[PDB]
Symmetry: C2
Subunit: 709 residues, 2 copies
């Protein structure tokens, strides 16, 4: 139980005589405006503040805000500056705490650096009543828990107006945006599953997968290892071919075009939605620059340079930042190197001959992801440290700049293994004549049997699927870190902002639009993550957290630029994934230039290249030839080269240049047309809606001609 | 001589009784506000209007505008709504005519459709005094002629403030923008001439031009005609090789990168410049939509549909518009076809044997350009007609939409021959085994001897150089169409807007940034056109034209979007001009893959392909073999194919695929990096300047704290 107050205060009861000395200076300044009262309880005492009327419209008229009017045309109230209710119970606790907090910022000797100084420990508004409990008299928070934050009701809409009224415009703006994201993922997921099912239908009626799964060929490949690997049948490893056609379907290209156009129309939908929201709440964009106090070490260094009586050191630490990005890349690839080398060439010790080499990939990805998740906090801390060194101007500039520097780091270490696997995997190894040795002592890396697409898909799928669960489970074992009202809310967690909360969503959006070329069904997994995530966040904002202060923002700001950036980067990278990785272009080239008939047959016989086994470099031979055939005289590998019985052997063939030319041509055409379409749907859909335009115009007319009297 | 009036009126003295009947209705409405007086003179009488004071600040306070204040902080006067001069001679004739014109628009029974109706013939403000003349008492127009509009003083700066004060914000905005364009062309031209001179230096020290100009080879090419052409020496046509190296220099690539970055920094410079101009004149962007009356056939069709008691027919005529664009393309190429066929295979008749075939190209381009310039007015008239059929909403929407539809047409017919020559010229012809016949009766077109770059350069150079002169000279032979003050100004030309005046500048900007890949030195020619053009336009606005009405705009609007569009389109098209046309990539491929040494030699011996002359299709042989050599057994052509003594003959060789792959790879890399750099310099340079920001902030502070008293 309490009376009707606004903002709390947590002092620390017992240098320290300076803490208690200066501690009473601030409330003497607070006698002038607010009516404060304090109390004594169990362990450490607290200070209380209550607003009185005759200064509250003084501060409410200090700034221009809108409140509901007296008149109402066409079944809806209108808004104006400050008049025509007169109840003395119409100021919401959100608004009351907002005004009180503005008085807290305005006077100083600010309370922010005073709070971080050590004299005060916390400064937070309280909430009315309690979530759930017994016999509460219709709490608003209880209503919000009963309608929004429970797992039982997930499929019903966001009650966005109530959450705006109770938590403020920023939090409500976040949940509104995530609502729009999850709502836009529905047709993306449905079309995703349609494309995957069309992949499932045409499995047993294609040419390449039959020709790989066929018996009676006795065709043998080159050993793909240095020492301890033998020759192997094409018909042996044929599951990966079946799933390969399940993923590189000629409908998946259509799905990629659909996804780029989907990202663009998502941007349009959200611009339109925040436009109508900024109608419904506040539209006056004349927010005062320089109003808030500056970041205090700029004042401290201004005292230093003021004693001395630079714009170069920031550029120097920007170069330091780029250095950090580069070794973030190469350290990422090093970590993938170690993870692939979790268990290499271990066949000599057990002699049990399992040699399945499938779960090895799974351990590589899992151990890999543990290293990413552990490294991520480190990169965040380096970001805060470096940005702290930079000494920016204000609070807003500090938050913006820190946001950017955090995002680059999480982008890099979160997407570098997928870039390594999708592109640079099995390209740089030579012919069986001469292998490319790294560290000048052993071979680089061979591809997966039948294509390096499977590692991409099962690696991608459990990052996007399981990153959250591995993060939540492992994060706690790692040591990461009649009752009175303020004593309840003191024991809650503090509030830290929304940047660690937006960040995961932007990266997830990356996993959607950056790799749906080789792997469809991705918006499905993002949706299944998303439904659980939104309600988990709601339960976090109600249960485990104290109230925020509700600073009134008008748009999310930087995150829209980051989304537009990722959504524009998507196109070129999907072009390279379709052309290079997906093995789609050699099928079309073989269907148009080397057909020998109408349709394709012997595509696999076209790709392979017939090495002569007598030409290894004295020790790169297989150790024990397995002799599945009686003997073996020639092995085959897939690199488009000429057979050895021609006068030139092992050189770069004609077909390599032909297929390379076709691949690059597809990159040009795809990138240009999809840039044009994505710019087109930007141009077509109006950023402003009609209803808001004519509705604010009608409101302006009725306000003026009702106002002149 | 006159007294001090503002706006004239031209009636038509003698159905007609309705003209004189309704003609007196408007001045009876004008008795209420303005003091009008009329006169009688020579041929057809006129009506005069003079403003009086006590209604003039009524209308000046009807709208918010800024006028100079009384106070001045830091050596500069400030501005505010309307107060604190009080002279009754401080309203400029521009402003007085502006207010009078607003009263002319506001009351109706509008004067615009009344003017186009037939009752009134003209309605124009007059000017003070006269340009030049004898013993004038310091005319402002005389000052402007003496300082700005004369050819004698061209190199001195634009007096932009005076022209804003005397002609208004729109005209001054035009001349300001063109000033920025011409000023930005200086370093572009200097770097252009540096690149051309670097081309001039390295002529006699290269490999390919020596190898073409060399004697002692006796190498012969295939005849390049159907019947009446013989075999020819490579050393014969060697001027075109020399100039070819003069144009496809490996420094010209650097110049192309410089030009894309130049276009982007031009956009930044002009955004910044109109920002400071909109500081100096008017910054309140809250201009009233729907204030002006609507376009009258929308009211007429609203009367029709109002009797009946569509949004599809506009889409249908948009499809009609796209049809018009397509046959504008193909008609353009047809016209080039005719112009190339101005004199074809005429060698049979004279038997004089000149056969120079150089001036033939010149006649093709000249006749071509006559056809473009004659066709251009037709396309303009179709644009006005079609847009008239569309029936838009307002005047502003009509001007915008007509602007767009005019620009597409002039873009298409102005750039289609250069697109045909640069790309599609000599690509589609086959090998000497089988030629590609168009119309199924005769051959398509061969390339120019030694490269199709010369036709591009000499065709481009005289369009951009001579289009203006041919337009001005031919345009007049084609029949294209004590004295009192208003009788002087009646005999002047009317005013038609700025769209035919912006249009030539945007197309010229196209000729700069769209084809500096194969042809440097282009900003030089644009500069030489430009200096003459700006002063010719100034002399036009002073001498041959009556005054405009000075509608206050705040930016050029649509033309900035068109400039950004062209400047963004420049990159991809420069990539294709460098890669495909410019013959730069085969030099690099030969320098890296078929070197046989360090540097290049025998590049020409590498390119040619050795056809066997015994394999023509019974009549495609040369008619009379010229027999410059005793006999001839093999001819050579440049198409990357295999010699006939191999088991495969005349097929597509390896080198064709290799060079094609290299070309497309260059297109990808160039387009992406130059998009990134052009986006980068957009991001770096601040769109807002510092001085304007802090200066308007200081003005706001001083205005408020000076205002509270």
């Amino acid at each position: 139980m309490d009376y009707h107050e606004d903002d709390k205060r947590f002092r620390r009861e017992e240098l320290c005589r300076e803490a208690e000395f200066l501690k009473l200076k601030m409330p003497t300044k607070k006698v002038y405006h607010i009516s404060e009262t304090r109390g004594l309880l169990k362990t450490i005492n607290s200070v209380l503040q209550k607003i009185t009327d005759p200064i509250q419209p003084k501060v409410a008229e200090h700034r221009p805000q809108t409140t509901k009017r007296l008149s109402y045309p066409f079944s809806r109230e209108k808004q104006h500056l400050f008049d025509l209710t007169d109840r003395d119970s119409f100021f919401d606790s959100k608004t009351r705490s907002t005004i009180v907090y503005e008085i807290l910022k305005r006077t100083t000797c600010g309370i922010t650096s005073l709070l971080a100084n050590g004299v005060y420990s916390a400064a937070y508004p309280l909430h009315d009543g309690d979530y759930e409990g017994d016999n509460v008299e219709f709490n608003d928070r209880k209503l919000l828990y009963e309608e929004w934050a429970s797992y039982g009701v997930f499929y019903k809409y966001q009650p966005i107006d109530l959450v705006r009224k109770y938590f403020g415009e920023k939090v409500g703006l976040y949940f509104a945006w995530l609502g729009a994201y999850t709502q836009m993922l529905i047709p993306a997921s449905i079309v995703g599953v349609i494309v995957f099912l069309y992949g499932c239908a045409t499995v047993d009626e294609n040419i390449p997968s039959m020709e790989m799964c066929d018996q009676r060929y006795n065709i043998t490949m080159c050993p793909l290892c240095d020492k301890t690997c033998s020759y192997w049948k094409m018909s042996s490893a044929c599951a990966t071919a079946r799933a390969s056609h399940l993923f590189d379907n000629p409908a998946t290209v259509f799905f990629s075009v659909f996804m780029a156009l989907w990202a663009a129309t998502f941007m349009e939908h959200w611009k339109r939605k925040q436009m109508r929201l900024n109608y419904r709440w506040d539209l006056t964009g004349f927010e005062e620059e320089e109003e808030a106090v500056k970041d205090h070490p700029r004042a401290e260094y201004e005292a230093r340079v003021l004693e001395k009586s630079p714009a170069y050191f920031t550029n120097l630490v920007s170069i330091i930042f780029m250095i950090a990005v580069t070794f973030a890349i190469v350290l990422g690839v090093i970590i993938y190197r170690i993870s692939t080398a979790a268990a290499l060439a271990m066949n000599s010790s057990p002699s049990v001959r399992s040699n399945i080499r499938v779960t090895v990939t799974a351990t590589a990805v899992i151990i890999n992801l543990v290293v990413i998740i552990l490294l991520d906090e480190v990169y965040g801390c380096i970001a805060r440290w470096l940005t702290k060194i930079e000494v920016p101007k204000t609070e807003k500039s500090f938050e913006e700049r820190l946001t950017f520097k955090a995002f680059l780091l999480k982008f890099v270490n979160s997407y570098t293994p997928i870039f390594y696997v999708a592109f640079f995997k099995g390209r740089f190894v030579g012919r069986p004549g001469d292998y490319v040795y790294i560290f000048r002592s052993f071979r680089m890396e061979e591809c997966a049997p039948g294509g390096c697409l499977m590692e991409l898909c099962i690696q991608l799928s459990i990052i996007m699927l399981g990153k959250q669960l591995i993060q939540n489970n492992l994060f706690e074992i790692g040591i990461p870190k009649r009752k009175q009202r303020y004593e309840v809310d003191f024991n809650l967690e503090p509030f830290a902002g929304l940047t660690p909360e937006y960040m995961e969503m932007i990266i997830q959006f990356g996993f959607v639009t950056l790799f749906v070329a080789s792997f469809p069904l991705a918006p499905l997994f993002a949706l299944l993550n998303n439904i659980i995530e939104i309600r988990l966040d709601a339960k976090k904002f109600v249960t485990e957290l104290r109230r925020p202060v509700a600073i009134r923002a008008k748009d999310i700001g930087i995150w829209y630029n980051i989304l537009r950036g990722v959504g524009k980067l998507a196109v070129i990278i999907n072009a390279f994934v379709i052309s290079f990785t997906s093995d789609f272009i050699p099928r079309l080239v073989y269907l148009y230039m080397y057909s020998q008939n109408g349709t394709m047959h012997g595509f696999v016989n076209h790709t392979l290249s017939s090495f002569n086994v007598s030409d290894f470099q004295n020790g790169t031979a297989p150790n024990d030839p397995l002799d599945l055939g009686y003997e073996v005289q020639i092995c085959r590998y897939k690199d488009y080269r000429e057979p050895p019985w021609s006068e030139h052997k092992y050189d770069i063939s004609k077909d390599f240049w032909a297929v390379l030319a076709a691949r690059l041509a597809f990159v040009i055409v795809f990138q240009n047309l999809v840039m044009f379409m994505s710019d087109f749907v930007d141009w077509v859909i109006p950023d402003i809606p009609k209803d808001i335009s004519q509705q604010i115009h009608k409101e302006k007319v009725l306000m003026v001609e009702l106002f002149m009297r």
